[PDB]
Each structure stands twice: as C-alpha cells, then as structure tokens.
Amino acid sequence: SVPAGAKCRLVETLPENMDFRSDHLTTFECFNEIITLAKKYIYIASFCCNPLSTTRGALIFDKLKEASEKGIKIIVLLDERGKRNLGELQSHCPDINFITVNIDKKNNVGLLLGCFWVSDDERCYVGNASFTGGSIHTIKTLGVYSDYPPLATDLRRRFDTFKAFNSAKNSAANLASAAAALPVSTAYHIKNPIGGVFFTDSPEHLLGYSRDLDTDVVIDKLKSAKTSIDIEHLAIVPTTRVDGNSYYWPDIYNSIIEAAINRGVKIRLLVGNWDKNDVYSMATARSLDALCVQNDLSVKVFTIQNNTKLLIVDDEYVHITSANFDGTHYQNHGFVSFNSIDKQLVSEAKKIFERDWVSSHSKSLKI
Amino acid sequence: SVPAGAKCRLVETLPENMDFRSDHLTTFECFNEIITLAKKYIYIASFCCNPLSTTRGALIFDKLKEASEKGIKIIVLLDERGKRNLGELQSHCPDINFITVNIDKKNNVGLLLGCFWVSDDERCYVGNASFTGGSIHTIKTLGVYSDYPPLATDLRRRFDTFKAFNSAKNSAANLASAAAALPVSTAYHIKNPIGGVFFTDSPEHLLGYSRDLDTDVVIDKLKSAKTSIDIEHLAIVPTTRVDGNSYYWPDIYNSIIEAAINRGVKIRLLVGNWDKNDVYSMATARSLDALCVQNDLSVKVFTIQNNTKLLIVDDEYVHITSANFDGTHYQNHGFVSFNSIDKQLVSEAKKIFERDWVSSHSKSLKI
Ligand SMILES: O=C(NN1C(=O)[C@@H]2[C@@H]3C=C[C@@H]([C@H]4C[C@@H]34)[C@@H]2C1=O)c1ccc(C(F)(F)F)cc1
C-alpha cells in the first residue's frame, strides 16, 4: 500500500542571522543524508554550482568529493551560464562529472533551474536550494525530501531529460534527431499522483506527450481556489525584462486578482522588494496596494536573500518550486515543481507560511 | 458588382457648444432621411427612448409620428429599464409600436443597446446615437449610414432577434421553447463581408450558430495590430461594478497592453474622466500613466458628454459600436457592432480620430 504523502517531509535553510525557526530537516542535513546513504549514484541539477562560498556548502562538497572517490557516480547538471566556477569545481573534484546544459539553443532564453538531488532511485530533494554555499547556509530556501523510491525514480526521469541537453557533441541540444530519440516519460502526474504527490514540468517544448505543464497546473489551481491563496515568491510583476526588452505576461497575475475580486478569495502575497526606479514594479506595487483597500488582499515584502517559491491553495494543495511566478520562467525555463494534495503535508507548509507572514523580515506593503 | 464600402458613410452628432467640425451627415440629417424615404417600415432599437429632451430630438419625433400616420409600420425597441418615458411616448405617438425588451431574464444583467435604425430593408443607421434628444442634438456621437439593401437587410435580422425578447406573453423572453424557434441568422460576417463591411454581435447566448461574437472579433483585431491602435471609448478599466459588486475582466485591457509592450504598437486611448474616489479607476489611470513613460502609449481624457465608441487598427480596420470596451458589456449586453476593412471608410474614421485627439475637449492624462 502506498504511504500517504509518499514519505515527503519539508526541508529548510533557516540562516542564523534571520529569525525563522522550525523542526524541519535542514538543507544541510538533507544533503548530508543523501550523500551518506548513496550506493550507486547522486544526480544534482541546479542553475549555478558554487558550493565553496560558505562553510556548510564546502562541507557538503567534501562529502560529495569523498563519495565520488568510493565509486559513486556523481553527475552535476548546471546551466551553461553558471559555468564560471567550473574550473574551480573540477580541480576540487576531478571524479565528479560536471555537465553544462543549454535547453534553449533555438533562442538562448530558457535556463536550467531544475533544482533537485536524486540518488539510487530511492532518495531525492526538490525545492529552491541550488547547489551553492548560499542556498545551503545563508539564504532562506524551502524544499521537500523523500525516500520513497517510486517518487525518487520519477524525479530521476527529469534528470534524464535535462542531461540530454549537454552543450557538447550534437545529440539532443545540438541535433533535433536524437532530441526526439529521448522518451520524455513520467510515471505520475495530476491525473495519477503517488500518495497524493506529483511533479509538474517546464518548458512546453521539453514536455513530451505525457508530462504536465506547470503553467497549466498552477493557473488551474489558482482559478479553482474557493477560500485562500497564500504565495511566497520573489515577484508577481506581470512584466519581466529579457535581452533589454520588456515582456508582458499577466496570466498568473490575473488569476490572483480574479480570485480576489470575482470570487472573494483571501490572498496573502509575500514577495521581494523592488527597485523604486523600475517603473513596472512601482506600478505593479501601486496596483496591488489599491486592491488591498477594497478586497481581502494583503501584501508584505522581504529584503532578505530568500529563494522560497511556495503556493498554497485552500489548505488542500501545496506547490513548491524553483521557478518564480512570471512569464520569463513559465514560458522558457527548465525546472520541476513539487505538487502535493496530502492534507498533512499541506498543513506543515501552511504552518511555514503563517510563520513567514508574521516574521520581522516581512513588512506590510507601503506605497 | 458589390460597391466597395457597401454605400457606407460616417454620421456624427457635433454639438454647437463643442469644437468638433466635419462635413459628415449629421445624426439629425440622417434620421430625417430615413423617415422621409420610408415606404414600408422603420425599426429603431436603443437602450432608452427620450426624443423630447431637445429641439432636434422632438423634430425627429414629429416626423416619425407623421410617418406612422401615413401607414408606415414604426416599431421602437427599448430596454425594460428605459421604460419610464413610455407613457409620455405613447401619448405623443399612439400609432407607433413601443416594445420593451429584457434579453436576460435569467440573470437580469444584460441590457439592450442595439442602437440602430433600419427601414424598408434598404436603409440603416448603426452607431452610438440612441433615440434620445441628447444623442441627436447635445451629445457627441458617431455612427454609420448605408442605403445598400443587402447590408440594411442584414441589420434588420438583428432587429428580428431582439424583438423576440418582448417582456410580454411567453414567447422568446419568457419561454425557452419559442426562443429556440427563432433562426438567429446573418448573411455577412468576418469570413464573408459585403463590400468590406460586416456586423458583429453580442451577447454569446443570443449568438446562434452563424453570427460572430464581437468579443472575439475585437480581441483578435487588437492582437493582430502591427502598427497602430486608436481607441475612443468611455473607459478601458478592467473592472466594472454590477449589483454593487465589482467584476474583474481584463481581456481587452490586456490585449492593448500586450500590443504596446510586446509588439511595439503605437496606441492612443481617448477615454472619459473618472471619479477620483473610485479606487479602481484611479489605479487604472496610474497604470496607464506608467505605461506612457516607457512605451508609445498615449492617453487623453474628455469630460464632454460623448457616446463615441471607435476602434481603428493599423489604418486597415475600423470598428464602431454602442458598447463600451468592458466586461459588463462584452459578456452580457445586446448590441450590434459595425466592422469595415474598406480602406476609404477607414481613412475617414482615422481623420475623425485625429481631430478628436487634438480637440480642446481632449486633455492629456495627468496623474
Ligand atoms: O493590473 C492592473 N494594473 N496594472 C497593469 O495592468 C500592469 C501593467 C501596467 C502597469 C503595471 C505593469 C506594466 C504592467 C501593472 C499594473 O499595475 C490593475 C488591476 C486591477 C485593477 C482594478 F483596480 F480595477 F481592479 C486596476 C489595475
């Protein structure tokens, strides 16, 4: 019988100089566990790789180095734009396979975030802690750890898809022939979750015929919200800038406002500070402020380094990812999002949002 | 051979105390022509009927009264909410058939605007001049007159649909049986225009299987705009208030911003003033203002009484209607919109927008 919640527990980076506390497994403890228990492989994917920037990051890197010397197959996927550290990394760990990835050779916009560890087809982390010293030690992050092999194995299948986009030797990133020669498979999805858990995926051109596009799942859940929407992301601005040209994409932004105005949903947005000289973020803040007057919309801002990407709907659905709710991300970037409708796990996430909401690092939107 | 433009010419109400001038047929001249030439019927549809409020309105009413006494079948459709004047109207013209209409007995939101005259299946006016003294004399309006029978006859078919919703005697407004027993037909549409002209229709539940929903045509044209978008409407606010409850509907609002930010379209919005205490209109103005900074978006406001509803895209498409670009209208109200891609007619409309844009009644958006 499948265990409800698929053996998932929350994982946090709660830096010493911030006021957040919890009993959850820390990112540092979690990565140490995955490395300690590994017998065949450890596969890691994130945008940047920079473990040596903090004390705990370098400790994790040493344990990983030691594993690679005992015969563990260690593969680290990073985006071709996070490749500056590469020589430093390869000199530290000559037995680890560092692979740079370009998932968007057509337009050079899409980036690999993935942000997960999987090991031995039995254990995995997924969330928003990159393989950097900051995400392991000094930056607030949120993720999920599971030792349920069916779920871990499903996450490794995302690693198979991303590894195909290696920057070398015309296979699936430099050849459209063997890029269709990779079955982009998933065992679980929103129509067939495992113990209440499933992964959603991005972008659409890597989706294949069986995976769920995270854009569609997220927007549907926002539009289904009957009571409450809690979001902790870096920004909700319907505009992003790419190539020095602004790009308007209001799909999520509209879904939130629609829930508030048309359906009466209580919404709490905890988002990052913005540049007062960025007219598109000032304008967005001013509009959010006006909605706070006449609706049950509330907005608070943080200035701490914080990678948390969390969405909770109606206390029945939790979504934790590495992507930010904006158009550059949901139209282009390579990442995998954690979805669960397990009531217990959702309650733990809600307990984390309530904490962050009243933290001293969260200040009510003032305009 | 079908005459290009389908014999259409613009029609205007240019009040004496405003600075607008043109050589176009006036609403007063136009209505006098339709009445003078009528041999079988005159069918009129608008929200309110109140001719006696101005000198020219009452003159039109006298000519209409005189026609009804010579044997012309005169039918005037008005919404059940414009029925206060009815006793005054029926005492003035006992031989005119005044019919009140409720197109939305299900929810009591949708209103009849129609706003057109058709006569003898040969002549018609369509635009935003209601059958009121104000629209005929003291309020700026814009419309189209044609004496091309194929086009007039197509407009009369809209009158057939609306007349079915009479508030009396369970047929198509109080019975779902004989409401499906009315063929909702059109001869022309966007896929089959007559001389470059076609009508679009609203709302969707009166649409039948062959008419175009105005929402879809308008949004498609905005999304197709390659160069320019010129709009003169009463408001572009993505929120409207119905039943003392606000309703968010950003579809058109988004299409405009998308054209400006993503596609570089030069946009000029000439809209009505707003209540400074209406937070949703203040917020909308503030956002439009921010877009004026970084884009080729320009906004001017008028305070005159002005019913003009005009959209021009790329100097290749003109759209003149009685509905305002908002969600209450495009989801609920009964109206017919004039569409033309005739280059000559579009140039005349563009000449009118350029005039209004630099009129002294048009003041640049100041926030
Ligand atoms: O979203 C609204 N305004 N608004 C945009 O359209 C965005 C675009 C324009 C400026 C910035 C960014 C460039 C993108 C954003 C902004 O704040 C808004 C929503 C609801 C209401 C109402 F109060 F009516 F309910 C009014 C306004």
Side-chain angles (χ1 to χ4, degrees):
Chain A
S1 59
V2 175
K7 299 281 283 292
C8 290
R9 46 194 307 195
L10 301 186
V11 178
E12 284 195 302
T13 309
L14 302 185
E16 283 83 2
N17 59 312
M18 301 174 195
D19 69 20
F20 310 105
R21 307 289 190 263
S22 80
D23 299 323
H24 297 301
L25 192 65
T26 72
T27 306
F28 179 67
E29 287 170 329
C30 175
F31 294 169
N32 267 306
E33 178 80 343
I34 300 183
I35 302 174
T36 297
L37 298 180
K39 294 168 175 184
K40 313 165 206 156
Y41 72 81
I42 304 178
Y43 297 161
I44 303 173
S46 74
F47 175 69
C48 192
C49 185
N50 187 29
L52 295 180
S53 57
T54 66
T55 298
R56 278 173 188 142
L59 283 163
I60 292 303
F61 210 18
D62 274 334
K63 288 302 206 307
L64 200 60
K65 173 175 178 278
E66 188 187 1
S68 76
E69 295 162 0
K70 311 311 173 59
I72 315 302
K73 199 189 182 189
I74 315 279
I75 300 181
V76 175
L77 286 194
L78 65 152
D79 193 276
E80 198 176 15
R81 312 200 193 187
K83 81 175 169 202
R84 282 178 195 87
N85 293 281
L86 204 48
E88 164 180 308
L89 306 172
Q90 293 176 329
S91 310
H92 202 79
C93 306
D95 293 321
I96 294 183
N97 194 339
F98 297 94
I99 293 170
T100 62
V101 157
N102 182 1
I103 63 174
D104 184 10
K105 282 254 167 54
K106 178 190 171 76
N107 299 133
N108 289 327
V109 170
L111 305 175
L112 172 75
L113 323 174
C115 218
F116 62 91
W117 297 34
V118 59
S119 168
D120 289 359
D121 279 4
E122 279 166 22
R123 276 163 287 283
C124 63
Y125 164 88
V126 52
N128 40 69
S130 301
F131 191 16
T132 69
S135 290
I136 294 177
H137 187 316
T138 55
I139 295 159
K140 182 180 190 313
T141 76
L142 174 66
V144 181
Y145 170 74
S146 169
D147 59 351
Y148 191 55
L151 185 72
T153 303
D154 214 43
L155 188 54
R156 185 263 295 156
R157 283 186 267 254
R158 320 302 202 255
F159 185 88
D160 289 341
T161 296
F162 288 142
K163 189 200 167 184
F165 291 93
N166 184 3
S167 312
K169 300 301 206 60
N170 64 335
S171 283
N174 320 314
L175 178 66
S177 308
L182 54 110
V184 189
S185 57
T186 179
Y188 309 112
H189 48 285
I190 190 177
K191 288 163 211 164
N192 178 70
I194 184 67
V197 176
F198 60 94
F199 300 123
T200 53
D201 296 293
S202 183
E204 191 175 17
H205 64 102
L206 309 200
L207 210 59
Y209 297 117
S210 70
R211 294 182 180 177
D212 299 322
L213 184 67
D214 200 25
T215 310
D216 293 341
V217 168
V218 169
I219 284 170
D220 284 353
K221 291 298 182 176
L222 293 164
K223 290 189 176 306
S224 86
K226 290 315 150 209
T227 307
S228 77
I229 296 183
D230 288 324
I231 288 164
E232 184 183 338
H233 271 237
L234 188 64
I236 304 295
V237 192
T239 296
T240 55
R241 197 164 182 82
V242 298
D243 302 330
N245 271 263
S246 298
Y247 175 63
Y248 178 63
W249 188 84
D251 301 24
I252 292 175
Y253 180 77
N254 288 340
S255 289
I256 299 170
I257 295 169
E258 201 189 23
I261 297 185
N262 291 348
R263 279 181 273 138
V265 175
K266 172 157 176 63
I267 306 183
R268 300 184 289 178
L269 307 179
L270 173 60
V271 301
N273 205 8
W274 57 95
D275 182 16
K276 307 302 168 180
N277 312 276
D278 165 45
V279 314
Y280 286 162
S281 282
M282 283 302 309
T284 306
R286 264 183 288 264
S287 299
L288 294 186
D289 191 64
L291 293 173
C292 291
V293 173
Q294 285 198 347
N295 300 104
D296 197 359
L297 177 53
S298 327
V299 176
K300 299 197 178 196
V301 313
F302 58 87
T303 62
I304 49 166
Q305 290 194 271
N306 177 20
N307 291 340
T308 306
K309 309 290 192 300
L310 169 67
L311 158 67
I312 304 162
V313 173
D314 287 353
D315 303 351
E316 294 169 345
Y317 167 81
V318 58
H319 175 275
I320 301 164
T321 186
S322 57
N324 182 80
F325 286 159
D326 64 59
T328 295
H329 281 254
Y330 273 76
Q331 307 249 279
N332 302 89
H333 288 344
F335 56 88
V336 49
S337 297
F338 171 90
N339 307 255
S340 187
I341 63 174
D342 186 64
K343 273 294 204 166
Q344 178 58 35
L345 188 57
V346 175
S347 71
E348 296 278 11
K350 189 79 174 199
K351 185 190 169 192
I352 283 185
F353 188 84
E354 299 294 342
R355 177 200 66 194
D356 299 351
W357 190 248
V358 304
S359 170
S360 84
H361 310 298
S362 300
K363 290 188 166 244
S364 289
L365 172 62
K366 197 180 301 183
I367 200 62
Chain B
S1 59
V2 175
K7 299 281 283 292
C8 290
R9 46 194 307 195
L10 301 186
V11 178
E12 284 195 302
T13 309
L14 302 185
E16 283 83 2
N17 59 312
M18 301 174 195
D19 69 20
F20 310 105
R21 307 289 190 263
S22 80
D23 299 323
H24 297 301
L25 192 65
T26 72
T27 306
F28 179 67
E29 287 170 329
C30 175
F31 294 169
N32 267 306
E33 178 80 343
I34 300 183
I35 302 174
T36 297
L37 298 180
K39 294 168 175 184
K40 313 165 206 156
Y41 72 81
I42 304 178
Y43 297 161
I44 303 173
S46 74
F47 175 69
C48 192
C49 185
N50 187 29
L52 295 180
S53 57
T54 66
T55 298
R56 278 173 188 142
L59 283 163
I60 292 303
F61 210 18
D62 274 334
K63 288 302 206 307
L64 200 60
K65 173 175 178 278
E66 188 187 1
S68 76
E69 295 162 0
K70 311 311 173 59
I72 315 302
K73 199 189 182 189
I74 315 279
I75 300 181
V76 175
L77 286 194
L78 65 152
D79 193 276
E80 198 176 15
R81 312 200 193 187
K83 81 175 169 202
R84 282 178 195 87
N85 293 281
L86 204 48
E88 164 180 308
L89 306 172
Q90 293 176 329
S91 310
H92 202 79
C93 306
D95 293 321
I96 294 183
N97 194 339
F98 297 94
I99 293 170
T100 62
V101 157
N102 182 1
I103 63 174
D104 184 10
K105 282 254 167 54
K106 178 190 171 76
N107 299 133
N108 289 327
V109 170
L111 305 175
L112 172 75
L113 323 174
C115 218
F116 62 91
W117 297 34
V118 59
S119 168
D120 289 359
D121 279 4
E122 279 166 22
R123 276 163 287 283
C124 63
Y125 164 88
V126 52
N128 40 69
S130 301
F131 191 16
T132 69
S135 290
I136 294 177
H137 187 316
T138 55
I139 295 159
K140 182 180 190 313
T141 76
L142 174 66
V144 181
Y145 170 74
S146 169
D147 59 351
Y148 191 55
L151 185 72
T153 303
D154 214 43
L155 188 54
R156 185 263 295 156
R157 283 186 267 254
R158 320 302 202 255
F159 185 88
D160 289 341
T161 296
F162 288 142
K163 189 200 167 184
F165 291 93
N166 184 3
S167 312
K169 300 301 206 60
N170 64 335
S171 283
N174 320 314
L175 178 66
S177 308
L182 54 110
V184 189
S185 57
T186 179
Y188 309 112
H189 48 285
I190 190 177
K191 288 163 211 164
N192 178 70
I194 184 67
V197 176
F198 60 94
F199 300 123
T200 53
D201 296 293
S202 183
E204 191 175 17
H205 64 102
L206 309 200
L207 210 59
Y209 297 117
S210 70
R211 294 182 180 177
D212 299 322
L213 184 67
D214 200 25
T215 310
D216 293 341
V217 168
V218 169
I219 284 170
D220 284 353
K221 291 298 182 176
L222 293 164
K223 290 189 176 306
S224 86
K226 290 315 150 209
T227 307
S228 77
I229 296 183
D230 288 324
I231 288 164
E232 184 183 338
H233 271 237
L234 188 64
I236 304 295
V237 192
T239 296
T240 55
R241 197 164 182 82
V242 298
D243 302 330
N245 271 263
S246 298
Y247 175 63
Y248 178 63
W249 188 84
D251 301 24
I252 292 175
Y253 180 77
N254 288 340
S255 289
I256 299 170
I257 295 169
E258 201 189 23
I261 297 185
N262 291 348
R263 279 181 273 138
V265 175
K266 172 157 176 63
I267 306 183
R268 300 184 289 178
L269 307 179
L270 173 60
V271 301
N273 205 8
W274 57 95
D275 182 16
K276 307 302 168 180
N277 312 276
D278 165 45
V279 314
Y280 286 162
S281 282
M282 283 302 309
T284 306
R286 264 183 288 264
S287 299
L288 294 186
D289 191 64
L291 293 173
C292 291
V293 173
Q294 285 198 347
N295 300 104
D296 197 359
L297 177 53
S298 327
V299 176
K300 299 197 178 196
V301 313
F302 58 87
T303 62
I304 49 166
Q305 290 194 271
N306 177 20
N307 291 340
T308 306
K309 309 290 192 300
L310 169 67
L311 158 67
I312 304 162
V313 173
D314 287 353
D315 303 351
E316 294 169 345
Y317 167 81
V318 58
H319 175 275
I320 301 164
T321 186
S322 57
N324 182 80
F325 286 159
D326 64 59
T328 295
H329 281 254
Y330 273 76
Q331 307 249 279
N332 302 89
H333 288 344
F335 56 88
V336 49
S337 297
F338 171 90
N339 307 255
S340 187
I341 63 174
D342 186 64
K343 273 294 204 166
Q344 178 58 35
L345 188 57
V346 175
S347 71
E348 296 278 11
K350 189 79 174 199
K351 185 190 169 192
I352 283 185
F353 188 84
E354 299 294 342
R355 177 200 66 194
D356 299 351
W357 190 248
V358 304
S359 170
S360 84
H361 310 298
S362 300
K363 290 188 166 244
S364 289
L365 172 62
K366 197 180 301 183
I367 200 62

